[PDB]
Design an enzyme around this catalytic site. Structure first.
Site, mmCIF file in Angstrom:
data_model
loop_
_atom_site.group_PDB
_atom_site.id
_atom_site.type_symbol
_atom_site.label_atom_id
_atom_site.label_comp_id
_atom_site.label_asym_id
_atom_site.label_seq_id
_atom_site.Cartn_x
_atom_site.Cartn_y
_atom_site.Cartn_z
ATOM 1 N N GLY A 257 0.967 -1.094 -0.181
ATOM 2 C CA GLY A 257 -0.022 0.117 0.150
ATOM 3 C C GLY A 257 0.904 1.227 -0.011
ATOM 4 N N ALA A 258 1.757 1.441 0.809
ATOM 5 C CA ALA A 258 2.554 2.565 0.905
ATOM 6 C C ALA A 258 3.946 2.148 1.821
ATOM 7 C CB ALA A 258 1.856 3.746 1.492
ATOM 8 N N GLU A 260 6.785 4.293 4.825
ATOM 9 C CA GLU A 260 7.052 5.488 5.677
ATOM 10 C C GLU A 260 8.373 5.944 5.576
ATOM 11 O OE1 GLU A 260 6.236 2.101 6.585
ATOM 12 O OE2 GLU A 260 7.500 1.410 8.339
ATOM 13 N N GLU A 294 1.046 5.875 7.290
ATOM 14 C CA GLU A 294 2.449 6.299 6.978
ATOM 15 C C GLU A 294 2.920 7.387 7.886
ATOM 16 O OE1 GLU A 294 3.410 3.592 5.542
ATOM 17 O OE2 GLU A 294 1.434 2.973 4.801
ATOM 18 N N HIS A 297 3.498 6.364 11.523
ATOM 19 C CA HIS A 297 5.007 5.507 11.655
ATOM 20 C C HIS A 297 6.268 6.476 11.932
ATOM 21 C CE1 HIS A 297 4.595 1.323 11.002
ATOM 22 N NE2 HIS A 297 4.023 1.463 9.550
#
Ligand SMILES: N[C@H](CC(=O)O)Cc1ccccc1
Ligand code: NA
Ligand code: NA
Ligand code: NA
Ligand code: NA
Ligand code: NA
Ligand code: NA
Ligand SMILES: [Zn+2]
Length: 866
Positions: A257-258, A260, A294, A297
């Site tokens: 998904g992404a 950090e 994110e 994090h």
């Protein structure tokens, strides 16, 4: 490929304190120069062992001396005879354009970008690629100015220049020491949405969202969510951002998904890009969640990182808890909790009953990219939420404050976190720690007794966790077990004993124990495991009337939903057994009446109504059974929808119409109404055919937003309505150039109940919008078929298994991470009947024989065939 073990952790023989990287960037051949300042902590005779994967080594120098005392071995460069402090210089080559796996430095369309978590930096240079080695990075990037006008890395720009032959360069510095998994680099040509956020103490932060040219129209909601995330972390956790610039880059080619990376997050564009004609309510809310995640994090993962990868839940459980608390605070807390519970009971429980079962802190890992799991993330978050339940908000925040005070700027362990919570709160978490080390789902059995002579109510609560394939030994856990007792009027009975109040969070710590409550003036209806207070299966012998009573009277909306779930579970199980005997659906009138009452209750929050009116998915249904019959479950789900549509037809239409909204807003009250309206529409699609077709076709055509258009399209597919083919073609004709929007349509194709679904899915491998090079497309077509159409996947002829084997044969070599995600439905074989197991085993055995079998698939296959 060799297993690693948590108990083998040892502090590194060498630390790196500072690394200076230079990238001479080119898609075909990138040259990396890495100058590290190192320090020996171990014995004078221990060599430095650097990780590296697929690197062409050019040179090795130690204090500018060409070094002769080294050797390359599988996955490593081993450097001997070093002084106590030295400068290491490595030059090496890599090839971004060859990187189909999308780990390390790779190409996403015309951009170059990185993904380094967990062990991807070793695909860029030879390094101590382990998260307990934190170093200060500076990063110089040199590239073609026309192809790569933006050159980005972590932190701030400190230097820049232009060179001959149309090249330029930018150097970045990040003052915070980091493990290398948090390194990022991006090069390309982007549109940039620019904004600012001022922190509570006055720090001004430049916000920059980089998107492909032409997408600025789809960026403002993600920017808005970023500011919302920053503000929330300040209000709720007291945390501010710590740098000057916050960069997000949206890329189309990404395995998860992404990510950090400090000051430079790299996102799958699926969790960035949104416009009201392209994105649903759920997409907006997922963008919000992932942007938040994110961002969160930055503290829970970056300022305090992980000592080793077995501690992954330290950051993932905690950050998922944070993203849920964010969503819940800004939106409907009940709907969030409901949906997170659905995930737990329907997807995570299934993993905890699978060959891949592991504790939230794993003990053994072959390929660490296989442990970014529902367990580590979602069960992890339930563990953190149990801590919150036990401590209360104020003590939990004191714990967070102590955790950061002790561990800011270092790599820590799950155990350190628990210890911070215990020490700040004075709550004993020694037993509770067993949640980190024990896999599998506990089953909590409750029996009750009311004594009218003494006005005492007794709960006898017992717990067991069945053995799992990873652990033969199981013990009792510290289970926070929240209850509420309701009198005949729906009022809460105060909990007390011997004249003192009793906390409503019971400490269930033994295999069996009894709790006795006094002054219980009426036989109670209990609400048990309130707000899913521990991640457990509850066994209590409910009457249907206790459940419908809770549906009307329970004071938390979650319990009202949960009671409806328990009511439905009984009749789902009934009707699956009936299906297997060739009999049609049977449902008591009083059950239908309960759902009618939800539709007509003018006081109920529509958000809550919508969820009660959303049937458990085929996945959640599957977890009700020891042996899964996926065809019966799919058919029973349909028949139940049909029966409710028929029985509640007038009420459904009335609620559908009442919730009509002419303006589209991404606002919680509006979302709730629309979710309720579309829940009504789903049932109406399964009613009388001519009315269904008209309602659905008209919604599709009149919709002024993708939520409503897609709900109509999805209903046309599910109910196989006459209009389906025309609507599906219309959507393709309009949206084929847009991959994210076509993902929705691939999911609908893959999840279709039509008899020829597999043929259609195979044909779509050639569709103009599909490509095996793109993980989102793979997941939306192939993943959705295997994972979300279990009825077709598990076709008795074995055709679904054969299709998946073919796709995995390609993906094993192209992109093992994606392969391993896609194999998961096959590793569940022991949940199915003998004939299906045999076919699934044969499929796994074919995969086991692949030439160049990836470690990713090897781990799962060998666990499955054991
Ligand atoms: N920490 C990242 C995502 C997250 O939890 O924030 C994990 C990740 C692993 C592999 C590929 C991409 C991302
Ligand atoms: Na030196
Ligand atoms: Na270090
Ligand atoms: Na400038
Ligand atoms: Na809220
Ligand atoms: Na790997
Ligand atoms: Na194609
Ligand atoms: Zn995360």
């Amino acid at each position: 490929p060799q297993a690693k073990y948590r108990h083998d952790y040892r502090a590194p023989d060498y630390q790196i304190t500072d690394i200076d990287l230079t990238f001479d960037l080119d898609a075909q051949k990138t040259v990396v120069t890495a100058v590290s300042q190192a320090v020996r902590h171990g014995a004078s005779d221990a060599p430095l062992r650097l990780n590296g994967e697929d690197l062409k080594l050019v040179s090795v120098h130690i204090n500018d001396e060409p070094w002769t005392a080294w050797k390359e071995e599988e996955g490593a460069l081993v450097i001997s005879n070093l002084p106590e402090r030295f400068t290491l210089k490595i030059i090496n080559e890599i090839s971004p354009a060859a990187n189909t796996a999308l780990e390390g430095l790779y190409q996403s369309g015309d951009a170059l970008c990185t993904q380094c978590e967990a062990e991807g930096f070793r695909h860029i240079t030879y390094y101590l690629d382990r998260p307990d080695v934190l170093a200060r990075f500076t990063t110089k990037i040199i590239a073609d100015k026309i192809k790569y006008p933006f050159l980005l890395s972590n932190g701030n720009r400190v230097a820049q220049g232009e060179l001959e032959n149309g090249r330029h360069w930018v150097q970045w510095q990040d003052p915070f020491p980091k493990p290398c998994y948090l390194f990022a680099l991006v090069a390309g040509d982007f549109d940039v949405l620019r904004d600012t956020f001022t922190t509570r103490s006055g720090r001004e932060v430049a916000l920059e969202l980089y998107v492909d040219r032409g997408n600025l129209d789809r960026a403002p909601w993600a920017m808005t969510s970023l500011k919302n995330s920053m503000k929330w972390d300040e209000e709720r956790f007291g945390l501010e951002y710590d740098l000057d610039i916050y960069m997000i880059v949206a890329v189309d080619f990404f395995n998860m998904g992404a990510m950090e990376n400090k000051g430079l997050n790299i996102f799958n564009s699926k969790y960035v890009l949104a416009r009201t004609d392209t994105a649903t309510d759920k997409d907006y809310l997922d963008i919000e969640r992932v942007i938040g995640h994110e961002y969160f994090h930055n503290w829970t993962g970056n300022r305090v990182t992980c000592r080793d990868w077995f501690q992954l839940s330290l950051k993932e459980g905690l950050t998922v808890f944070r993203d849920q608390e964010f969503s819940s605070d800004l939106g409907s807390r009940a709907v969030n909790r409901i949906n997170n519970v659905r995930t737990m009971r329907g997807l995570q429980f299934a993993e905890d009953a699978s060959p891949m079962a592991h504790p939230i802190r794993p003990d053994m890992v072959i390929e660490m990219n296989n442990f970014y799991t529902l367990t580590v993330y979602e069960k992890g978050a339930e563990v953190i939420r149990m801590i919150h339940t036990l401590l209360g908000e104020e003590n939990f925040q004191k714990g967070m404050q102590l955790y950061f005070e002790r561990h800011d700027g270092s790599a820590a362990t799950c155990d350190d976190f628990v210890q911070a919570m215990e020490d700040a709160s004075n709550v004993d978490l020694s037993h509770f720690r067993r949640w980190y080390s024990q896999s599998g789902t506990p089953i909590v059995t409750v029996k009750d007794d009311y004594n009218p002579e003494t006005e005492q109510y007794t709960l006898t609560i017992s717990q067991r966790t069945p053995a799992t394939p990873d652990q033969a030994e199981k013990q009792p856990l510290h289970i926070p077990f929240a209850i509420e007792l309701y009198d005949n009027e729906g009022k809460v009975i105060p909990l007390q004993k011997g004249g003192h109040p009793v906390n409503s969070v019971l400490n269930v710590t033994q295999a069996e124990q009894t709790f006795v409550f006094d002054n219980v003036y009426f036989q109670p209806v209990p609400a048990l495991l309130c707000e899913f207070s521990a991640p457990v299966k509850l066994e209590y012998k409910w009457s249907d009337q206790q459940l419908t009573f809770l549906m009307r009277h329970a004071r938390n909306d979650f319990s009202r939903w949960d009671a409806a779930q328990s009511l439905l579970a009984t009749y789902i199980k009934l009707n699956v057994a009936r299906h297997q005997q060739g009999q049609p659906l049977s449902l008591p009138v009083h059950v239908a009446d309960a759902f009618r009452a939800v539709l007509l209750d003018e006081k109920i929050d529509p958000a809550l109504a919508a969820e009660i009116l959303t049937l458990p998915s085929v996945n959640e249904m599957a977890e009700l059974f020891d042996i899964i019959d996926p065809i019966a479950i799919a058919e029973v789900r349909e028949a139940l929808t049909r029966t409710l549509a028929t029985e509640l037809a007038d009420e459904l239409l009335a609620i559908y119409n009442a919730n009509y909204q002419s303006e589209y807003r991404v606002e919680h009250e509006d979302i709730a109404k629309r979710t309720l309206r579309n829940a009504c529409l789903r049932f109406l699609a399964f009613g009388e055919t001519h009315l269904a077709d008209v309602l659905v076709s008209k919604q599709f055509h009149e919709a002024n937003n993708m939520t409503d258009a897609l709900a109509a399209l999805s209903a046309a597919v599910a109910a196989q309505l006459p209009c389906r083919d025309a609507l599906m073609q219309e959507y393709d004709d309009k949206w084929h150039q847009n991959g994210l929007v076509m993902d929705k349509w691939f999911i609908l194709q893959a999840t279709s109940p039509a008899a020829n679904v597999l043929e259609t899915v195979r044909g779509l491998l050639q569709h103009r919008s599909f490509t095996m090079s793109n993980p989102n497309r793979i997941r939306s077509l192939i993943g959705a078929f295997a994972g979300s159409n279990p009825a077709a996947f598990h076709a008795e002829d074995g055709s679904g298994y054969l299709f998946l084997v073919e796709m995995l044969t390609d993906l094993n070599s192209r992109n093992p991470q994606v392969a391993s995600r896609l194999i998961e439905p096959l590793i569940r074989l022991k949940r199915y009947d003998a004939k299906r197991q045999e076919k699934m085993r044969a499929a796994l055995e074919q995969l086991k024989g692949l030439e160049n079998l990836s470690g990713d698939l090897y781990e799962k296959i060998t666990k499955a065939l054991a």
